[PDB]
Amino acid sequence: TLVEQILAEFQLQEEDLKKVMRRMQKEMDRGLRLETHEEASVKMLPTYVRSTPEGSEVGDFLSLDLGGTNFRVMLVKVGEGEEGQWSVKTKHQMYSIPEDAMTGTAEMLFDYISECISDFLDKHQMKHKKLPLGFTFSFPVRHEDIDKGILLNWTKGFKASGAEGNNVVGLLRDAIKRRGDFEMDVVAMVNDTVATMISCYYEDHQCEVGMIVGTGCNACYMEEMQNVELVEGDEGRMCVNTEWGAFGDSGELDEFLLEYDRLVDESSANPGQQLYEKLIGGKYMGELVRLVLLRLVDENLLFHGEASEQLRTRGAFETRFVSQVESDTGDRKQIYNILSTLGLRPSTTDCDIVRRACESVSTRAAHMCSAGLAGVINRMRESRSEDVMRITVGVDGSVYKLHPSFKERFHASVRRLTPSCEITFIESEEGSGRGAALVSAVACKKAC
Numbered sequence: 001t002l003v004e005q006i007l008a009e010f011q012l013q014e015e016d017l018k019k020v021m022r023r024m025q026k027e028m029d030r031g032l033r034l035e036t037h038e039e040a041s042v043k044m045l046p047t048y049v050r051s052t053p054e055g056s057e058v059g060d061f062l063s064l065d066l067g068g069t070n071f072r073v074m075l076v077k078v079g080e081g082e083e084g085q086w087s088v089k090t091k092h093q094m095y096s097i098p099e100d101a102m103t104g105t106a107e108m109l110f111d112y113i114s115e116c117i118s119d120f121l122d123k124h125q126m127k128h129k130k131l132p133l134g135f136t137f138s139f140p141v142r143h144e145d146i147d148k149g150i151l152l153n154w155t156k157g158f159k160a161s162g163a164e165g166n167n168v169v170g171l172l173r174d175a176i177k178r179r180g181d182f183e184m185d186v187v188a189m190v191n192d193t194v195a196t197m198i199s200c201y202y203e204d205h206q207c208e209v210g211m212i213v214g215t216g217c218n219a220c221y222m223e224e225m226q227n228v229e230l231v232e233g234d235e236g237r238m239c240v241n242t243e244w245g246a247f248g249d250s251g252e253l254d255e256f257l258l259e260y261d262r263l264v265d266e267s268s269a270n271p272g273q274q275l276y277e278k279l280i281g282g283k284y285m286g287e288l289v290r291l292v293l294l295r296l297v298d299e300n301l302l303f304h305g306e307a308s309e310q311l312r313t314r315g316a317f318e319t320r321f322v323s324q325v326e327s328d329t330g331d332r333k334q335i336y337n338i339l340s341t342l343g344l345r346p347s348t349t350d351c352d353i354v355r356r357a358c359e360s361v362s363t364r365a366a367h368m369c370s371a372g373l374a375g376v377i378n379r380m381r382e383s384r385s386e387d388v389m390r391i392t393v394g395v396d397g398s399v400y401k402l403h404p405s406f407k408e409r410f411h412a413s414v415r416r417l418t419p420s421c422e423i424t425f426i427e428s429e430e431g432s433g434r435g436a437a438l439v440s441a442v443a444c445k446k447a448c
């Protein structure tokens with residue numbers, strides 16, 4: 001009961017979720033308007049990705065993916081399909097980011113990116129090939145066009161100095177000039193949410209929402225042009241990057257924030273920023289569980305009130321451990337092994353408590369995430385005339401894909417909050433790479 005009283009703090013009633021949903025909708029409306037776009041916690045950044053009236057280039061494309069724990073370079077072949085365009089990743093290489101490069105300047109980081117591109121083109125006999133470049137940049141960008149935009153600020157622990165406020169495409173093109181080895185036609189820069197939505201659209205034309213639940217958490221959707229006041233025109237739709245991770249940054253989530261949320265935030269690389277994301281993302285989930293277990297040990301409710309050296313160190317309870325604990329069949333074998341590796345010798349009840357602590361944090365993440373998506377979907381419903389809105393949501397991220405129960409708790413909670421909406425959820429197959437190449441193929445018809 002004492003353990004259950006502490007875990008009860010993570011509960012969110014239907015009215016709590018509807019309140020989050022309504023406040024998300026409010027912040028989304030505020031971000032789209034000129035008078036409030038600047039002070040808005042939910043930035044609602046125009047991407048310049050429009051509902052295209054046909055015009056795509058076919059062939060091989062080079063796709064870049066910067067945002068995750070590592071960095072990826074891939075080759076994607078695009079062609080004329082039934083729907084419109086098919087796309088397939090043919091070659092790929094993952095590169096790790098060094099400590100001195102992540103701490104170093106923007107020019108140091110982008111030179112390393114340019115060095116990785118050289119390594120890929122050399123080890124694939126294509127340095128002599130002038131390919132259009134597609135760039136998936138999983139960070140908040142204020143766009144001037146499809147191939148132009150400034151980094152607003154780093155998120156998810158990134159720190160490369162002299163990057164914020166500068167044209168990201170400009171940094172990459174300058175780094176390529178600084179090398180002289182190869183030549184790239186940097187054609188498009190898209191967010192990971194956008195890349196995911198675009199790749200899912202060719203499988204289902206009803207896909208007008210992109211959502212990422214991985215290290216970070218964010219969504220994009222197709223907004224009516226007349227509602228995107230930060231761009232000129234009233235015809236068609238434009239994809240808007242909500243940057244919903246920053247919801248709560250103006251105090252919108254204060255009544256829902258817990259001692260563990262406050263501890264994660266103070267110790268993070270961005271204190272006071274990405275608060276909503278800090279309740280959901282894989283960068284923070286395992287850390288939230290760690291802080292809960294530590295509370296239980298101080299209250300003498302877990303491990304006889306004794307925590308290990310590893311359990312008392314930041315980042316030790318990895319997000320994958322949350323997913324592993326919740327995959328346990330009931331024999332406690334998976335929980336025991338995780339805890340033993342963390343230097344603990346848990347009892348049968350300690351294992352059960354750790355499971356409960358994991359479910360409490362991951363259920364809150366799924367429910368909080370659902371209120372956001374329901375907000376986007378109901379906002380889209382309002383700006384349309386039909387009996388039932390049938391919409392497809394394109395999804396990516398390890399938390400949503402790999403966690404044993406997140407997906408289902410999330411789907412059930414979204415459907416509950418979205419009446420007269422028929423939602424289809426599709427997972428992206430190489431969404432970041434294919435999406436960036438698909439946007440690049442259309443953008444090529446105008447620039448290259």
Ligand SMILES: Nc1ncnc2c1ncn2[C@@H]1O[C@H](COP(=O)(O)OP(=O)(O)OP(O)(O)=S)[C@@H](O)[C@H]1O
Binds near residue numbers: 069070212282
């Ligand atoms: N089995 C797992 N279950 C749940 N979460 C996990 C699992 N494995 C890793 N993670 C976490 O999820 C994150 C990695 O998510 P990824 O899908 O690889 O996306 P990413 O490319 O690293 O960055 P973004 O923001 O999600 S596009 C890290 O924060 C991990 O701690």
Ligand SMILES: COc1ccc2ncnc(Nc3ccn(C)n3)c2c1
Binds near residue numbers: 050198438
């Ligand atoms: C739902 O809307 C869609 C669906 C699929 C798409 N595939 C490629 N490019 C798209 N849009 C682009 C690229 C460049 N611009 C100015 N607009 C695109 C837009």
Ligand SMILES: OC[C@H]1O[C@H](O)[C@H](O)[C@@H](O)[C@@H]1O
Binds near residue numbers: 140155219243277
């Ligand atoms: O990667 C998932 C998301 O993580 C962070 O919230 C970024 O600010 C956003 O650009 C990205 O889409």
Ligand code: NA
Binds near residue numbers: 225226228232233
């Ligand atoms: Na407009």
